[PDB]
Design a protein around this ligand. Structure first.
Ligand SMILES: [Ca+2]
Lengths: 43, 59, 273, 255, 59, 57, 255, 43
């Protein structure tokens, strides 16, 4: 599909695409020492 | 009470020590800066940012 | 093709993924194949509709106001009479969108405003008037309208749109924050004073919008209602927070009703299905 | 031979040790760092006192009773009287910092109880009154004492509702924020490294708290028979990568 | 003028004092100037409060 | 990137930019680094909205 | 086009200017520098607050009368209440620094008078009583006020003898120390850059003053007819290359 | 972004771009003899 911007300002443009750079880790594993699934959580 | 050329003149007194000469807030869109060219043009815009230059000339 | 699940068989290992330590504060990505024998299947899915651009990318009503068109002769308070009205642009007066925005702490985006103006003539009138509304963007510091036909409506430097009642107006607005992002929350004050407000910051200022009917007056009164919709474009959101549970009570305040005590649904027995 | 449980943190002239840790959380997977030129606005040179402010300061102890609701500290407020840090905090117009928060609670293999130790960026508190009433400055600026959640509420202060996180959100969802648990059967401590999080490069350290450390008993403290029904809770905090600017005369704050 | 966005104060005092020569007396004045440095920026154009009118003008 | 301010340290020179003569009718472009120790920062700004085309556009 | 007379000194967020200088003295031809590893003993890391302490602080003004004897300031004592410098000075067990001393006195091409501005390393003062009596701590620790030499002597304080340099040596020989004159017909100011001079790498900033700045009228002030018989004397001082160590709780001193 | 003129007359076109040839000097330093910041304004 095609799109050309009709306006000078960047704000005028439509929606930005899909980020495709998801990374739940910053929220799900913000641990200092790496923990590996399957190994003792605490040794 | 009325605008007059004396508004631009900051008085200085001899043999005074430790004393204060003037004070003012830094509201460029208001107070003493409102009528100046900078404050005059600043009031055509909403935001401002930057460094200011103040010169004091002795007469 | 991305795999949703892989083929996985029986186990008898020393590697126990079923056991962990939530004390650490982490949530390890276990998959059903860590505790069950599985088959290979495909995601057949990318997750487009959950992108924050999507989530906040649709128009939502953010304000409803009213104005009128009468004969302003003898009227001393045009604002009270309803000849013009204001709106201190804020996105927390209507709750549907407010809960969505607040899922995050700082939020940066462009705005796409759509304004709808519908008319009504509640009492005896020969016809329905075709009115024109003016919407003026009044930045803080610009002079405020006082009468419905002030010099202020000249709007030489303030952006304004003229549109017809029954029609709609649409324009975009760049991210107008003085900081790098908008604050959904702000645990601070304007200055260290014992009595100054808390939370509300100029760090969320988006402006004030003024409204009026440009036409003079007919024989009847016409009531114009304005609905403002906001759509966020080119979105950026940081630091996710806990959803809002309690009702909202005020704009820009986390305050909640003190007699609201049962948000979680109750059972009788923890054992029932 | 080394363990995830025994750890040492040396910051300046202070060293902390724990033999019963449960790893540690580095908020949003980001370690503190100073302000960069690309991000800087303010043209002034920043002061970096280093080892004189970037050391561990220990707050006044708390007492975990079996009826305890929780405690809340606001940063940088809680450290405003802490040696050279507090000084610098009131001579400069702006400052910036990250911290290493170390919460301590030791017990007995016979005790049971669980604490939730969480760091909340921008914890805007709800008022006792509700409506359009704001939480007075002095109530969000308790200093070292912090906010004790089982204290009677006053006019203009925050609510004392742990269940509602003092902000209209539910307790269970507090896990979306960098947190750690102190489960006696397991834990002894909780350590959280906090980077600078804000919408502006640098800010005023007195009119704005960037975070509030919250320690909330979830599982009631249950001591063994004949044992003392309480346990103290100690909080040790170290500013890291601290920067100051806009030096002048001492900032004047309410009280 | 908004509190959160205030710029501070500006003041002047005698470090020593003004000393006048013999046969001289009265007050001396200082002239102060304001301008922006190249650092400066202004955004979000709007209408000023430094001009208004009650009626349209005519010749 | 254009520089808003450069890194600048202490001084003790014979070159005194803090002193001038407004009698001349000129306004010399002094910068905060002429009277203060500064850090490097970027303009991150072009000045579009102040172009006369904008101003009267 | 440049002159030895017009000068600017920028240190931190303070800039001084003079249009009537007479060069400047850099004590023993040595510029201040930090402590090196070769010279260091104390194993601790030194704190360098930079631009927050290394800026110009202006002392309370003095009044040059035609009968004036002189004034004496002791460093680092005179700057012990000066912003973040004084703070740091009382939280650390040890410190080290050099200074830029700027003495000011403007007048009229009709006046005549001459001041001797000198920096004396280790100025051990003589007591009012003589004998085996020592000069009490508080008398050598006047702070910003300094020692005004035409003030009546008290028991346990120093002598008020400018002629004897308050130490048993003669005034004229004070020229062996880094000094500068303020000769009205010529001068306006005097500037002296002082490096760290001591027999130990680092030291205690409270129990020992490394130098004492002395401003002594030599040629009496003689104002024109009908002019005010006095002139004020201002002293502006900037610590340079400051280092602190042995941080702890606030040092406790007499008073 | 794209723009093609639909009209014959130059007046019909939209706004002109940003000048990018700012020079405050004609207003801030219209002095005959050059003055250098840092050197004596008057010698
Ligand atoms: Ca009809």
């Amino acid at each position: 599909y095609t799109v050309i911007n009709y306006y000078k300002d960047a704000a005028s443009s439509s929606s930005a695409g899909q980020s495709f750079s998801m990374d739940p880790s910053k929220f799900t594993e913000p641990v200092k020492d790496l923990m590996l699934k399957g190994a003792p959580a605490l040794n | 009470t009325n605008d007059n050329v004396t508004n631009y003149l900051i008085p200085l007194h001899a043999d005074r020590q430790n004393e204060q000469i003037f004070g003012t807030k830094l509201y460029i869109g208001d107070g003493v800066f409102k009528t100046t060219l900078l404050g005059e043009i600043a009031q055509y815009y909403t935001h401002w940012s930057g460094s200011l230059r103040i010169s004091l000339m002795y007469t | 093709q991305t795999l949703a699940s892989v083929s996985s068989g029986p186990k008898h290992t020393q590697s126990v993924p079923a056991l962990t330590a939530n004390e650490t504060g982490a949530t390890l990505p276990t998959r059903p194949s860590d505790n069950v024998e599985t088959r290979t299947t495909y995601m057949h899915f990318n997750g487009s509709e959950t992108d924050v651009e999507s989530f906040l990318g649709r128009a939502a009503c953010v304000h409803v106001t009213e104005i009128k068109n009468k004969n302003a002769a003898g009227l001393d308070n045009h604002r009270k009479e309803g000849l013009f009205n204001d709106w201190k642009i804020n996105l927390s007066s209507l709750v549907q969108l407010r809960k969505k925005l607040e899922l995050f702490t700082y939020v940066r985006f462009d705005s796409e405003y759509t304004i709808l103006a519908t008319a009504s003539q509640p009492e005896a009138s020969s016809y329905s008037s075709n009115l024109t509304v003016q919407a003026m963007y009044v930045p803080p510091g610009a002079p405020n309208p006082k009468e419905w036909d002030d010099y202020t409506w000249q709007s030489a430097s303030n952006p304004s749109v003229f549109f017809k009642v029954g029609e709609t107006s649409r324009f975009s607005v760049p991210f107008v924050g003085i900081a790098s992002a908008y604050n959904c929350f702000y645990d601070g004050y304007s200055h260290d004073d014992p009595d100054t407000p808390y939370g509300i910051t100029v760090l969320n200022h988006m402006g004030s919008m003024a409204f009026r009917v440009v036409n003079e007056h007919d024989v009847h009164t016409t009531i114009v209602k304005i609905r403002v919709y906001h759509r966020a474009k080119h979105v950026e959101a940081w630091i996710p927070r806990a959803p809002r549970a309690l009702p909202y009570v005020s704009i820009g305040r986390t305050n909640y009703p003190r007699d609201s005590k049962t948000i979680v649904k109750k059972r009788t027995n923890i054992k029932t299905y | 031979g080394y363990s995830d449980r025994v750890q040492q943190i040396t910051l300046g002239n202070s060293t902390i040790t724990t033999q019963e840790a449960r790893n540690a959380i580095v908020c949003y997977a980001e370690w503190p760092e100073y302000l960069s030129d690309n991000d800087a606005s303010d043209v002034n040179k920043t002061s970096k006192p280093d080892i004189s402010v970037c050391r561990f300061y220990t707050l006044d102890s708390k007492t975990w009773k079996a009826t305890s609701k929780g405690w809340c500290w606001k940063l940088p407020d809680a450290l405003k009287d802490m040696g050279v840090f507090g000084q610098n905090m009131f001579y400069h117009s702006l400052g910036r910092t990250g911290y290493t928060i170390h919460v301590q609670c030791n017990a007995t293999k016979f005790h049971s109880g669980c604490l939730l130790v969480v760091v909340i960026p921008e914890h805007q508190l709800a008022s006792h009154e509700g409506g359009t009433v704001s939480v007075k400055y002095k109530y969000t600026h308790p200093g070292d004492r912090g906010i004790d959640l089982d204290t009677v509420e006053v006019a203009g202060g925050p609510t004392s509702d742990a269940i509602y996180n003092m902000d209209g959100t539910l307790l269970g969802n507090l896990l979306i924020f960098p947190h750690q648990f102190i489960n006696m059967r397991t834990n002894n401590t909780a350590t959280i490294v906090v980077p600078y999080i804000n919408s502006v490069p640098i800010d005023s350290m007195t009119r704005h708290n960037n975070v509030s450390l919250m320690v909330v008993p979830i599982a009631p403290l249950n001591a063994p028979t004949g044992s003392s029904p309480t346990l103290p809770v100690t909080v040790t905090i170290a500013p890291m990568c601290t920067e100051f600017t806009g030096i002048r005369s001492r900032s004047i704050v309410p009280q | 003028p908004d509190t959160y966005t205030s710029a501070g104060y500006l003041s002047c005092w005698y470090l020593t004092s003004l000393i006048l020569p013999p046969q001289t007396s009265g007050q001396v004045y200082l002239l102060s100037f304001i301008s922006a440095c190249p650092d400066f920026k202004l955004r979000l154009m709007k209408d000023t409060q430094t001009i208004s009118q009650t009626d349209a003008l005519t010749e």
